[model samples]
Target: RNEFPEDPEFEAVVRQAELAIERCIFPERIYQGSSGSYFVKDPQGRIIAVFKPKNEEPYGHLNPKWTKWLQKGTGNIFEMLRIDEGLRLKIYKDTEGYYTIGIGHLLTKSPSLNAAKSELDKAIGRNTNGVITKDEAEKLFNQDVDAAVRGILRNAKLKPVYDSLDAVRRAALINMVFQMGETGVAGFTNSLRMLQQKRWDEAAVNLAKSRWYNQTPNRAKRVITTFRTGTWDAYKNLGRDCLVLNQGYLSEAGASLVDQKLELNIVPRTKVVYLASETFNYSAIDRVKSRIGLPPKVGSFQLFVEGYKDADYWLRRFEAEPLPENTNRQLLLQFERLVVLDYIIRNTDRGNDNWLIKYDDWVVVKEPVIKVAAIDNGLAFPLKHPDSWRAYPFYWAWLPQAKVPFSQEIKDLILPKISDPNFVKDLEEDLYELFKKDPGFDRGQFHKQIAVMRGQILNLTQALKDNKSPLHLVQMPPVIVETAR
Candidate 1:
């Protein structure tokens, strides 16, 4: 909005400027060397008025005479300082003695000017010491990071290549390019070429051979892990390989088995076995009978961890404790995979308390290494999406981690395998074997379970194909099928 004379004849001029502002078509090039001016245009893009701040140079506190005069003549001022001066504070005089702050914005004499000064005080601090808040700094940081990502995409002409990578891989590449500027990233010509060519393993090896990797082994490990696994190092899950049975337990083993087949490495190894425990859930009568050494209860047992804390305990710490950028990236990427795994299995009970995070202090001064672990898969693979509403939403979908489109690498890795006839056949057979161990297992329900899984896989393929976010993808229609065993 601009100030204009209220007379009826001048009303046309004000209307023209307002229309141009609305259309957003007639703000001509800004003359920035002086305090600054806007050259606005009329309906036909004809110059109508040159707007100058009252605080602008060549005229201090003067109503712009040019708005009324100088309609056709070139202005006299030939040269001035190159105005790259960014945000500033302190009530200093300009070339002429005029109160000013923040990139030459006038700080005296008008209500608007007072309002601007007040805003500047809030933004840069009350005393004009030029300190920024964390929230403000974070906002600025995001802007630069987005700009850098855009620059990499534009300079390398890499949007097509970028879209092919999953979120973790994309972040890894962006992080690499950020650490090494455009020219530095360009030096890895062979690695970039291999990545574009879809030679993932070769690309990993190529990246590893570089001096960048040699100099920063920890960073290199993350990049290489992403290149090979399609997820970050923090997302890796490794243990003694195995399988499990009996409804939910079978689902857990099946999840791990599918992860292994897809090379997702998401679930820790789980297997069905018998084990006696005083802590096991049993009736008092059963416990007393078991004290006489009755046969152990049959269930799935996963590898036990030495130390880990629930996600809620760690999330609060993370919010209060600042982490290194690399560590933050690693944790976020791994957390993204956690969401991915939960969505894939339709895990119905992934509360913050259920998942685990492990932290280890390798050195005193450095930030500790962090890892996310998905545990307690007991509530996953429901026969159908919950009919009652309370537990349906995958809570992690609300996270920024889940906001990204499905990565090409993960899609490429899982889609074909899931679609394969033999893959489902093997999986169904494995599940069937596990189910048979329980006397109460129903073949009809088992077939329906496999049918549901098949539907989930089909939905996953389409979601990946469409590049949908986890939130968008999980809204898929629940599946149940009657199949001949």
Candidate 2:
């Protein structure tokens, strides 16, 4: 309890307390009630004290009275200062650093920051399994804007411009950076630099170089016209084919893009999107089997190898006897060609491990190994790589005598496959015609190489059928008969 200097009543109490304290050796000795007797019940049925020291610190944070009240209503001073049964006896230790009360209590009640971040990463790591609607992105974008404004204040020299940017611009920037990076803020760096120098003409010139110069309205009517007329094809014209392929499946994409009013398609249904649907068990019966061999006891590629092992075991155990030459060679060769084509396209995340296998269920078709559907063309069309060659883990390279003709047939198959589907044939034809219109496709110098790429597709297909990991076999062709050197 504190002493009052002016008030007659408090002065009398202070004088009596001071006189009592002089008999003690230590001035700050803690007070302990030895023979306490009270009977006061609170609204929550907890014991409450009617008489407390007027100048004492706040109390009853942990007591049922304070806790129950705080739970029902807004938190009061008692809860704010973290008081408890022994609060009157306790004193402030120090208040120096970031001392958050409510948020700290809420966050630290369970998992650590590291665990939370890890969980967030795990949640964001994969393709969204056909969920997370557009409205969610808009909601996330709103929160992101608030957080970004706070960040700007935290990292800058002046008051933030939170009032200046509108929600649409903020939403657009948020969605853009979701795919890009934090530094992808709107406006021209050159314009900003010129503005610092107070050069209006130079700033305008610099601003013209900005990405937004082409996207948003300037002082002129031309700018507004360009922006309003822009479509998904305009986005495609900006040349992000891989991004186009990632729509509808990846998070913060598809419906999210639609909600943001961003364009996703260039030519709409005309675009030939490659599907890379890998399989584990194409046969429905085998997929649901209770004793379908073993479990996932290896790495992803090894898992694929093991998945095919059951097939091998069955083949060796039952279909051991061979009658004629090239009985199933055509089908085997077809599979091999497919594998090589997939490999060339850098579709490594394939086979049984990548996707759930769906067989021909049209009117309940029976047991089938089935053909692989090419989905997930994200890593396709790699411009360059870390080393001379790109990595292909599940693929086995160097399958002896099979190497010679494999490369040539694969490229040839692309046109045929693209044009095969009745509904999709026209689009495929257009892609071929588009490639052909370029003089490069008809050139004699590049013809042989193109032909080799085609064969390579077939060869790689054979390789998959052989379970020859391009990752494992790696180019050691068997020697043919040689003349004397």
Candidate 3:
């Protein structure tokens, strides 16, 4: 006999399983009953299918009843497969009145229920008296979550839409699809269209107006927020502490690039990039929604120095052990270069802690050469100078060496360039392009910031003419001038 004329529902289940297997998604299988009844698992590895064998009138099986007078089938009888749903450990009754355990394994024929319980525990890798351990349960929990994530993503119709989104948007959609299924989400056709087109605010509005949003108000609010911002936030309207400006990461890159343009290589190489990680600050809702993982966040990443100390750390070492004349001169020259960079950018947060120092020990000459790296340039390029009493000055300006006149080497590198009209125009163009990358970049405020820089440059040109120290130069009255906008 063959297992033919399968129930329509059973055939449909088989088709789904085969499709998943074809796509390299392995659905968990549970073999039960003597007549080849198999339970199919869902994304969460739960028994979604309790197979009733085919040849047994209700389910499927392949066994022959050769004689025409035969009343019972050749396969296992349905009476013996009665599952006790009330118990934590599932048990069934056999034809011989024996206690049967998981998947119908006969535990005992005797009346002692404790004997059956002992066998059940032993079969599942537990001691006669022991229950499941925390680590073991946690492993199984993770397995279920993994399968669930794959199941949500395995949909043919929705997979492409999910793939088109960036990591942040994908996180929101993955959670939505997981709960709503492929068909359920497809109902929001207009919202999906706006989402695909990257019309975030309109897409968010569409989602907010849906019946789904009405059903789960709290969840929909969070999802809508993510769709609108293309990022997940726990604090609702309160933005993240790390994301200061609308494009903080982009600003970091711009600051570093500006330093390089000015021929000041003191700033560490930095760039704006996206990274997906759950280790960053995540809210409770975000964690619950993205059990698989959180989406990527856009930010600035700077190159790390291998062996560097705080500016104060090196400053102490320098004072304790004075360097040789040549090394000392080299270190002072680098410091002067740092001063020039800070003044041009009008960096509001240039503290000793913000700057870094790397020392190279010259074993041959028994002297150490030092290099200064500018960092924490985030607070630079303000539209206006500090107006409040919370004044943050360039703390390093008080250093005795900073009070000295600019060295001829620094003058040769910077003087002619800063004085050039073409050079000033080029600098403005570069800054304009860089600042525009931010969504909240105000054209009027940017012009004011650039104007302040021009003023500082004009003052610096005068200082160079007088051969004056940086301390005297920075304290001079503000120079207000105009150049090519």
Candidate 4:
């Protein structure tokens, strides 16, 4: 029973959540609390039950009050769409006969191009003609998508749908905005009404009954299916069910945030997404409802990295026959970045096979590089230390590279950020912002989570100061340095 204890901090945050719910500027928000535990509020702006699952995050499994306000920033179907739309290097005439370049980005009325021209010229050798490099086109396309994403977020009518929908479904709206412009998509008055009510199947049908659908039937189906299913088949294979308290797409997405804060690109772009597939872990009865089209499973979608193999595979190859000294040295540096990431997140299940390695060998001229990618970082940020038989350990500690002393390069990059008082507070606040989105967020547990992290962080600081290696860092006794209560 949650009736076990109560404190000033826990009670104070309850009061805090009440206020933040109303003045909520972002349809989704990170409501602050005195401790880490919280019952993330619903769109109705209330938390009815303080009790939640032992091993599962409410994970938006049910339509909780905060249900409509699920805080994921939304989709990559736009990310999923470059191949569907295709790319063009040279300026081409759009269907409307306007001058366009680089994936249908407008040049004629793109006002920022006037201001953007100088920055582009300075970067790209000053060519303002119809032709542009692929990089230039990419820059322009991002501007187009940014403007589109920005406008959709601002639409008052779509707030509930936009805030409520998963990343994929909401991105369907963005894709529509891209094709039709906000005004053009807005032409589907009936479609928007249907979507506003979130009658997604009806919304898909309404979009089908359009002149735009007549203009391009093929792309519309791809768009319609995403709206109808609100899922990408790509995310269907997501997993690791026995992860205990760490089993959540929120945890998956949270590690990405942790990866972001540390400026380590060890983790790829993983975002919270909603997807539906027969592969979901639902029961047979619910899978029938799944067939009848229930909401998509909310989970993390990590963009697949190219040319990578298991860390176990590559590490085995490297041990059998060491890489060239140039690549060999850089690989060690990359390993430290990996170490920094795992320790700070307090990852409980970082086995060798979970991460991957991409050895980029362009080497007739001897320019070779090695890369490591951290994936499946879900079993992390535990609310407490191990009382479950085994203690924490990183598999990488068993390797040779981790045994070396700290390199000045890796030391300087992270040591500066971790050492700063202001950075620590900022990081903690940002993490609080990210984790608090889970409906099961507890202000109390989140503090312990942060405490373990800060303890790891504080421990690493001294290890670096003493010129210790990644190997030495892991063996050190776990520390939990608590500050002001």
Candidate 5:
């Protein structure tokens, strides 16, 4: 619950931060000492509390994390190989002319079919019909992939590497072994050495200059890039491709950027990022292109936030154990900010299920630790305001907090900025820079979108100035700022 006592608040001759005494508002006292333990005193300069340092004072986080690690199965690795391998029910000749079947499983390393057999192959009489049923193929495929998965473990370094990566990159590692043959991949002795040492970039660079990269460039490229970066993809793939105006990924990051510019932490941080994973719903050809460094889809990457409940669940809690009057006031203010964020962005898909709420049920509401997240913002930023048969509505209107008037805190925080034309223009330009990053950003439509927001801000400013409730704010006639010539 405590860290450095002196920070910005303790400085500026007002005594802001670092190693010095920091003020407390409640019982209003100053804490003495630095990182470790400190002393606390009350009015009349009487010592009341002496905060003791934890055992390792200068070292250690001092707080134990009270959480459990959830276990995930290895299905991703097995399933990931299927897409790249192109399962075949019948034995087919591979690129190098080896008899291949069972999701890219080779009958033998040698070109001849007589080289090796799984015994199950003979039981199914693949020699007689030269084709196996789907069930049999699945049985063989399951065994072979598992064998490869276990096979790579012989590299003493692999256990740590295996444990280090997420399921995506972990699968990426084993899949390479399956394709290259366990012993064949074992030939990169130095690369394996580098991997165990946990020097990722060097290992990737060394893995790049190999015989495998020359033959199976795509898979080699994909796996190599994955290990080098040590990351995978996010959210999901798109419902639109090659659409003139479907830059939804950009919107995800842009919404977070707006959250940042507004100086609010309502939206989790997001940014455009390039990621490739077999887990992503891309065609085999797309995966092929990604491996050869053709660069697959770059989408919005938002970091995950923890300790938050879905707004619906938390809101349900409020009904039964309703917030105290003072706490509810803070909630009204926060809800208005959510209103401002959604209103300014004109987010079209903000269902209660999508956004999140986080607060301590500890009734530490005196400090009012309540916060909300405006995530799942992919379906936002339309070029035009709703003018069709179905108008976009803010769902939070039904929220109990919406019944209250715009709080003075909202007016103090937003009114000055929203009332100024220059602030609106600057906000537009900043968004322009962000939105223009999309390949399909339309400049003409961009202004129209901003015009819609300026009107939103105008309405918000007036509502806050006059102390109107969220219900009253939403009922205002939709208007757009004029923006030509």
Candidate 6:
């Protein structure tokens, strides 16, 4: 650890983040009730490895003037560890002191990892490796409840009042501010909307009645608890119970009171939107097929519907054409690889709408030429018996269902020319690396985030557990425009 300078500084920041979160975010009543520790021991008395912070202080700001306010919204407590120092001194929440399964994305450096990076860098030095960009990584990371908070704040417009809090509280509030976005301070909005201008209790009631609140009942309920002196029992729905509770100020003890305008404009990005047009359930394929006026096409042979003159007709005509070597083929291969990888990972939302294909543009190189991409990942990890992976049927279904005559095609067409020994190891390593590098990620403190997540999906059939999830769909598969019937 001493080999790196910023490493220690970084460690210091995470330590401080825990303190800040307790002092700034949770209401005193709630925060005080919180055990607020890290590294919880498991049922077997063995510690689970995860990162989580429990309980928090709420209330915008407490005082003669700021007493009446709402505690709204928050993410990676990692940055707090990077910046703060005093946090290291706080007591643990559940155990003797924080270090539950909550602490994850270990901060210590391994020479083996650094060496691997150097090797890979040298092997593909200064070259544009066919890998996703950092921006893409950001989008993927945003799939979580925590990252969404920062994404909402960064992408939207909102002016908020900053309370005079200590560094710990300030950093912690940043997480909440980003998580809640403009909605975090629901009681004070532009011209004090009906919900905000009304009595704080009334505003909270009104805010709770809003559509967003309805969509996220569990989280919404927690938000309401931020307004008072008492904390609600932790929602067991998120994971196992007995998490650390916050213990500190209540109401506006660590808050600042003020008004601000939040951005209401909608910004749309060019993403592969998941849509299902089903005669029965929501089918991505049926809906997309209707909208694009095409039929479902499967496998590499028929994937050319996106390039043919009469796209819809070509989709039905299954052809056995090898892709020509060119940019289009390269992109197609990348898309195909992603599909197989997701399948291996048992990504449930994999259907047609989750993929992107530009029919208008085609580059002629080999026998097959087309462009494609995949997006959207909602269901991941935690193999369950009710899920196909648990039953083992999902793991064995793909090879038999392949449209191609070749049995190996199911695995062959999507990945590298052949499987490398390091495939799974590298994937796990990258995923963990991604978690640690994140500015917001914190080592264990008040909550056991990672351990809880792992514990959630620890069960799966021995035959099909890929990345801890089933390789098959949980309910029904999504129906893309041309990939399903």
Which lDDT tens digits does candidate 5 get at residues 1-485? 12213333212211121112322321121233222222223333333322221211222122111011012334556655665677777667777777777677777656555554453356566553566777777777788777887876766645566676666567777878788867777677787667756687888888779887887776566677667654322101112111114455566767877787676678876665443222223334555765553333345545556678888898788899988987766666677888888888778767788788888758564455788887767667766666541446788887777878777766777777778778777878877886786665688877777777788887887888888898888888878887668
Question: Candidate 2 lDDT, tens digit per residue, 1-485?
Answer: 33334335534433333343243311221234211111122233332211111111112122222234434321122222122111211111112221112111111222344343343234335433323334433333344444544444453221222223232223222222322234544333443343434443554454456554354332222222222221112221122222222211111111111112111111011111111111111123434553433121100000011122222332243346641334334323444443443443334334332322222228876544422322222233222211323334433233222343443344354434433344233432332443343222433322332233333344444454455544433352311121222
RMSD of 2: 32.1
lDDT of 6 by residue, 295-348 (tens): 321100000122223222323332344334464344334343343434333443
lDDT of 6 at 50: 14
- The local distance difference test score of each candidate is 0.56, 0.29, 0.59, 0.64, 0.62, 0.29
As for lDDT, the candidate ahead, 2 or 4, is 4
329-360 per-residue lDDT for model 4 (tens digits): 88888888888988888787787887888887
TM-score for each candidate, following the candidate numbering: 0.43, 0.27, 0.47, 0.48, 0.48, 0.25
The candidate maximizing lDDT is 4
Q: Which tens-of-lDDT digit does each residue in 327-431 have in candidate 3?
A: 888888888888888788777667788788888856587544677888766556756555541365767768887888888888888889899989978988887
Q: Tell me how candidate 5 scores on lDDT.
A: 0.62
Minimum summed lDDT over a 10-residue window in model 4 is located at 26-35
lDDT of 1: 0.56
Tell me the tens digit of each residue's lDDT in model 1 across 184-288. Answer: 677777777678777887887777788687766654666676667653222221110111122555555556655556665546655553433332233446657
Better of 1 and 4 by lDDT: 4
TM-score of 6: 0.25
Candidate 3, superposed: residue stretches over 4 Å from native? 1-248, 282-295, 361-368, 388-390, 480-485
